[PDB]
Amino acid sequence: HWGYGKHNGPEHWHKDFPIAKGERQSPVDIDTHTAKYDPSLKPLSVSYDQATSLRILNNGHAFNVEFDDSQDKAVLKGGPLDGTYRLIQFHFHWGSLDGQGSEHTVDKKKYAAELHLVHWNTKYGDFGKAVQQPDGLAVLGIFLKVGSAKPGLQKVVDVLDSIKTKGKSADFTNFDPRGLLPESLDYWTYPGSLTTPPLLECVTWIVLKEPISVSSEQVLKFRKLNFNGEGEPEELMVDNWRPAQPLKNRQIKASFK
Ligand SMILES: NS(=O)(=O)c1nnc(NS(=O)(=O)c2ccccc2)s1
Ligand SMILES: [Zn+2]
């Protein structure tokens, strides 16, 4: 099965998922001097006041926090988007060391981790249909740097011991993702793909300029998770990030100058 090890990592994915060598794969390095300011881009509208989290799951390559998306509770609109996108899950990618872990990079700089808030376009009726469309998903990406603790993250950090191995899940209600956002919503955007198999090219990426800071202790707890199932030999869940892919015939646009 695919994963992040030496024998089944990103460099091998293309044998089972040939779209890995596609025209708009992600992630990609954001060159801040060649990104184009676009004054036509609108501010992001993040409406998370009615979000309903349900549970947290270790899926063997990350942990997902899942939300109820049966109704327009937590939605993303505006920015480069047309239409309403519903939040369905968030997850992180992180490194074994503080100098790596993010998927996108900024002028080749890597961050300690990257938060992905995944949303789908409600005009396609369900998530499975949305992932088959070029504008079906919108993922909000937020960088994490190591510094002062993020109070909003601690609820997540404290439950990780309950889902240490693959396939474990726990109830995770009344979590407010607003506590994970930076102060500013300035962003870069480009058309891209999921960064894990099946690597579908259905994503409008929105990457926030301002990182959030988390403490060393907080990220350390991430690194104690396991890729393996219970009873299996222990493999720590670290470096679950895909390297930057070529930009090809794409333009990254900036919401700010
Ligand atoms: N890193 S990333 O692109 O946001 C994603 N990686 N895995 C994801 N999972 S997911 O959206 O629930 C998903 C699950 C099944 C098929 C397509 C997408 S999103
Ligand atoms: Zn992701």
UniProtKB/Swiss-Prot annotation:
Compartment(s) where it occurs, according to its Swiss-Prot or TrEMBL record: Cytoplasm; Cell membrane
Effect in UniProt of substituting V118 to K/R: Strongly reduced CO(2) hydrase and p-nitrophenyl acetate esterase activities
Substitution effect: T195 to A/C/H/P: Strongly reduced activity
Quaternary state and interactors: Interacts with SLC4A4. Interaction with SLC4A7 regulates SLC4A7 transporter activity. Interacts with SLC26A6 isoform 4 (via C-terminus cytoplasmic domain).
GO cellular component, one term: myelin sheath
Cofactor(s) recorded in Swiss-Prot or TrEMBL: Zn(2+); Co(2+)
Name of the coding gene: CA2
Reaction catalysis annotation: hydrogencarbonate + H(+) = CO2 + H2O; urea = cyanamide + H2O
Activity response to pH changes: Optimum pH is 6-8.
Protein name, UniProt field: Carbonic anhydrase 2
